[PDB]
């Protein structure tokens, strides 16, 4: 049951934050609903969840339109999958956040495709921190350059960083990789305005990411099931 899973996940988040001396309010739960049907999202919505993460543009847009047709207010939709140039218009027209900025041309497209009547699209820059098998995300060495370029796009708002670390079994490495992101995040916060979002941690590494300094865990299966 989705309402039960939501409350439980939220308890683990709340425990994990206070144990490491953090207010639980600091951590946002992003309910990842890729491969969940709109009916499962509706259950989470009714239980109070407002923030949802989608990986595949067209399915995400279908879910967004479904709930617009119902009139549901206060939802916040995060695109967290890799963004292809031929589908960037759909993200710019329908989503509130995009976590996967890893090249300037895609961010310029998003900027130029964002309808004028909408507020700026909130974006995160994606770091490939530890995954030699992913083509998504930049190296940390490229961050200062890309962040400066993206920060000038007036139809976007740079909010921080996202990473999908390579999967790790040892809690030690989970923490250590998450800390590299946390360190990059704090360094970025010392010069850029409104840097407040570090999208870091999934179901299996949630405690390490929070201890490392994540502000936003992306939880799918522990909420919606397989
Ligand atoms: C699917 C996915 C998640 C959620 O994964 P779970 O293991 O089900 O918690 C989080 N972030 C991204 C980028 C994903 O693609």
Residue numbers in the entry: 3 to 228
Task: Please give sentences taken from the publication describing this entry.
The pyridoxal 5′‐phosphate (PLP) homeostasis protein (PLPHP) is a ubiquitous member of the COG0325 family with apparently no catalytic activity. Although the actual cellular role of this protein is unknown, it has been observed that mutations of the PLPHP encoding gene affect the activity of PLP‐dependent enzymes, B6 vitamers and amino acid levels. Here we report a detailed characterization of the Escherichia coli ortholog of PLPHP (YggS) with respect to its PLP binding and transfer properties, stability, and structure. YggS binds PLP very tightly and is able to slowly transfer it to a model PLP‐dependent enzyme, serine hydroxymethyltransferase.
We serendipitously discovered that the K36A variant of YggS, affecting the lysine residue that binds PLP at the active site, is able to bind PLP covalently. This observation led us to recognize that a number of lysine residues, located at the entrance of the active site, can replace Lys36 in its PLP binding role.
